[PDB]
């Protein structure tokens, strides 16, 4: 008949293929379609929903619930740094078990703008200003407020509005940075410093708790697919 | 902003064939349970596929099942010296069908069942199965009991009624003894995913319920304001 | 037949379906581009939320009926619009400093209230959307936060491994089960640790499910209009829980010495468009 | 020639296939077509013909012919239940060797409405009323007439008409219930109770015999195919 | 063998006769209470399948010297079905009834009977 | 048999069913039943009522008994 | 050539036939969507059935001739329309209380009656449809039921295994063989148990074959108009039985003390449009 | 009412290949009946196909015959050490043809007969046969004798004249001894089915007639009004 030639690639089982195959249940009608709500289309729609990030991830605190609550004590400090973390969405301890990180950990390359929204859980009468600054990789982490001021920053008035949001910008040499960031294709540090000092009246408790929500902005993308290095098994579990 | 998502879709996240089961069955007389190898169809055995399914509450897909059946030679004496190719038979059993007690049984004819005979040294055997359930979606989580008086099993182990795949050799092997291993692969296509839900933080311990041990949230760093390393690991 | 299309980089591909089954084709993998407050009056019991407050409408959809387009029943007896739509108020849980959290299981938490536990006790099937509204009376010197979330199909793991769970420990009749900040040592109870939310997932990752915050600074109450989510269109309410509320305080409440210390929390659910099928002269218990 | 590639699925023998094959008797004409009556098209047309169901399937009775005749003694009872059976068309002893069951036993899933027609074989002068009630799965089997009355029921006047028919309705959580019904996807009990008590005149015998015919209504369907667990063999019979 | 009418109401039928008359109340068929003559405030739902079945009561036994029997139907269906599970909760109530009383006959069993639905007895 | 399709008769349009009886059945045999020696003597009588278009108002969380 | 169609779920399939034989194509598997009584006067002998009684017309079809469109014979001599169409009455079987059942084998049960056993004794081939009418005289105090059924090709198993059957035990000449309610112990006879109907099938499942009921309450007689059913159009009537009557009482007859106890049952068959071929000067016996 | 029947058709109930025969034939000298393996073509040997045919009185179909010929190695001494592939020959014999007495006979040329040569390690051999009979339908039940004087055989064993399939090896096998097993599969297509009839309640005992032992109707339950179980099997 037709004199074909078997090219290399014959009798193989490449996993990420798209081939046809004969049916094992022929002429088998299905149950008709129902409209269950929440039909997700793309996986990145889970990485657009905020998930609290464990910012106070200290050794004693991680086991406890008190790893998500960041302390904002009231007094005259003006030097204390409320928090600082390298903005590595994949390897960093802060963002890896957060929803953005878990979908991201599945995909090898990450490109987009992360958004951190810091809510203030505190008495209505409390008022204060905090400077949150994304310092790009440049040289060394910000260590005093004057160092942080130069880098992109937002001054948030706790009293005027709770929930100030910082959309950390995408400034990078390459279009895509590997989730396992190296010194090359790394990301800059993010830090928060007191601007005026929390002013809490006599009737309210001086201490307050601030929490951090992290979700990707609309322009986020993934480039490759790989095993998650978070879950494992030993035998066929029964 | 011209960096749209194509490999983040619900297809390409789930159209990859993952290994689901590892069987082992010999080809000798005596101990007739070692001749064949049964498997109730779960997706909950292997973890590498289970975590991908347990991001969504409900699912609906068509599947592409494949088997890489490989065999070895068992040690000892009375070995083959020479051996023709040996073929394998993979039989699906529907929920509520008669199962074979052992090899060379009466019930291995498979008039209604979709058996498939595969020869060694060829491409791995392949078949497609449609969305087969009584319900409208393959529910990955069923927060409810079996009986209306709240007894019986609890969890997802009430709507997983998909029967079993029973595999056997179809050669007598008069001289020697030789095992074979079956590796089932599931590649769901035309996938629709409803009601997303968080990934499992704790490790898996069972294939019957959502038992777990209370694990930490993340790993520990040094302080609240630890930025990692300021210079490289040297000096 | 003889189709031509584009691929992700002229360049094209011509793939034909050689089989007589719809599930035998390849994967698609291609895209073709004194003050004013609102008052919800449902049934014969109103509420007063806020003018400025947002109301989360479920997974986007409003709760509606099950039309004839997607019904698989045989005969369909009547559904009431006034008799089971009232804002039923459950028991008031009490918020303290070291309070861990509380949960509910609502198809088996309204069995005593009104006729909602007097219709589902007779009919075989059931379908209802819910309009949860949880409130706590605020003040300006009572800092603290709260998270509510209606997780659907919240399969909870047992305390001891290779055990099942018991219905007395999974749900309660009128009370909300606590969420031990530590680990339960029970032989048949639920694994009720608070930093894993029962299901084993990270408790920070409960924000996919419709959620709202009751931050005491800028919010007094919270209202989630959850829709009926199930694979099968109709299932019995006594052997199935449709979803699960979870009220977990992320920030503990810190008052002062001369301040009130008995801050309560109530939940005021109301079933919307409750349908029933399969009347059997049973009277379950 | 044509450089084809052998996909997985080559050199296999899937049983439920549809492939072409060369002919062993080429150019072989056939005998011409004849119109034998009774040309059935679909198998379910055998499951639309009534077959008596062995309702009195007691241990001593099954061997005997007296397993198809259900007793309806005449007297003042008003509590006696003439018959009751779970309406499981596949596993139940009552319906499994009946024609509806035998075709159904071949197919794994069953969806439709069964019809039971209960004929009265009795003296012309006899008169009585019986309530046949399909109680849906709900809670517990009907044990007294007041319990049965709530569930769907038909009052049949034996004197006015013989052969009253009950079309048991299809009320189910799922579109299809497995023939091997479990507690889930099960079916409700069916029962018959005396309404007035048979009134037989002096000239006729008091006892009478009622028989049950079971055939699927028009809307019946099967979904899968499997070995019948009713017939077996040991060796190649010669 | 013969034709008999079958009233199918709810999910429970009967079989009366082809030749038998059916007395339709005081001339009128049972119908709903429209908005033209309602004095209520709010009107929750009424079921059409859940409470319409042909509920069968207990079987009274006819002897030679049997005097008579009576019932009181708004307080005689309180246990049967959901009709005693809707009126146990709601304050008001309104329902028309479709009584069907039967006794199995024979040609050598002479005797008569009178049924009557007296209102406000 | 006998079938009476009685309508709802009351002065007020709505009244509670636990402190009011709408009507009353009365089965009175005017002629006694006379069988013979070789005949059945356990003739029963059943009643098979069915409420048509049952309406309800005023839902109160009561659960009367 | 180059066909396109639909499959059971745009989606299509193009299958071509590559072979020159009609039996080499694939399977199709696709669909393209004082009183009035009637009196049958046949031959010169009538009956009187009922006005209200149904008459079962075979497998849907009326008995008709074998036209020239489907004949394989060489020469076709005459068929009579009056000489063999009469309602021949067979022997009267007697119904008692513990009567098991009766059967017949009609191409070898009319060999003595009229000319129907005087035409088929000479000609080689044969073809006739039948119009069975079985009657029993009823009364109002004689409760009991009956089932008649014309099973075609009723192959009957022998009493002892690894034996054949004998023609003296399979059919009778003028009598109907009984259906032992127990099991026959014979070495060459038929396995004539009543709860397996001879063929080994369930005796409740004899309702596919054209059947009618002679329930003594609402029926006096029964008439089945069976058509000629055979694979070959013509076959000899002495070595082939076309079908088999089976009169099995499902409910036994229960009279009273002062009542008749000799209730008979007769069968009154009549061959319709009997054709014959192949006249050979044989005179078989 | 939109639940119409597709897998209940006469095609899909009968277009499934069932095993019909199990042969066994060696490849050594001595006992020449062990070299080949004959089979008169019935459908009455295996039960799993026989019950599907004996629901209808007459049939008419075209068939697809397939053979999974597998072989083993016989024990003992003088074994092969090394062995090329061994080919099998399947020959149809029509009714009234000359049959071979043994292997290497004169009559194995098969000039008119449709022989087919099959090599091991390949796909199973396949052929199509049309509706081949002298009659108009494959009658599954023949209530009639053979001779006009009512002697001879009785039953279906008079119109089953379909000849035999005689299979042999076509290698001499100078060194070793090795059996092989033949498994014939019948898959009838274009099926038409006339005059339905009830399923066989009793078990099958013979392949010559409709002999049977008198069995019960169904299984026994407890009472007339036994509803089975009211609660689960526990407590
Ligand atoms: C080719 C022979 C073998 C054929 C096997 C039949 C098809 C395989 C079954 C399909 C599995 C459906 C996907 C998962 C089903 C359940 O929802 C999950 N196990 C949930 O636990
Ligand atoms: C390829 C070589 C072998 C060719 C075999 C010839 C075709 C097979 C014979 C067809 C069988 C016809 C179906 C059944 C026929 C009889 O009616 C049944 N056995 C009835 O007992």
Author numbering:
A (entry chain C), D (entry chain C): 1 to 238
B (entry chain A), H (entry chain A): 55 to 289
C (entry chain B), G (entry chain B): 2 to 10, 24 to 47, 79 to 330
E (entry chain B): 79 to 199
F (entry chain B): 266 to 330
Sentences from the paper on this structure:
Echovirus 3 (E3), a serotype of HEV-B, first isolated in 1953, leads to highly contagious and severe diseases in humans, such as aseptic meningitis, myocarditis, and anicteric hepatitis. In line with many other HEV-Bs, E3 utilizes CD55 for viral attachment and FcRn for viral uncoating, gaining efficient entry into the host cells. Following rounds of purifications and analyses, three types of particles were identified, one containing significant amounts of viral RNA characterized as mature virus (or full particle, F-particle) and the other two being empty inside with substantially different sizes defined as expanded and compact empty particles (EE- and EC-particles). A number of key structural elements, including the VP1 BC, DE loops and C-terminus, the VP2 EF loop and VP3 EF, GH loops, contribute to the serotype-specific antigenic sites and construct the “canyon”, where many HEV receptors often bind.
Cryo-electron microscopic (cryo-EM) structures of the three types of particles: F-particle (~ 64%), EC-particle (~ 3%), and EE-particle (~ 33%) were reconstructed to 3.2 Å, 3.8 Å, and 3.1 Å resolution, respectively. The external surfaces of the F- and EC-particles with a diameter of ~ 325 Å are indistinguishable, apart from some disorder on the inside of the EC-particle, including N-termini of VP1 and VP0. Remarkably, most of these loops are key determinants for immunogenicity in HEVs, indicating that EC-particle, rather than EE-particle, has more potential as candidates for the development of a vaccine. Notably, VP1 C-terminus, appearing to be the most divergent in sequence among the four subgroups in HEV-Bs, is largely disordered in the native virus structures (F-, EC-, and EE-particles), indicative of a cryptic immunogenic site, akin to the VP1 GH loop in foot-and-mouth disease virus (FMDV). In summary, the atomic structures of E3 mature virion and the two types of empty particles reveal serotype-specific structural features between the subgroups within HEV-Bs and underline the potential of E3 F- or EC-particles as ideal vaccine candidates.
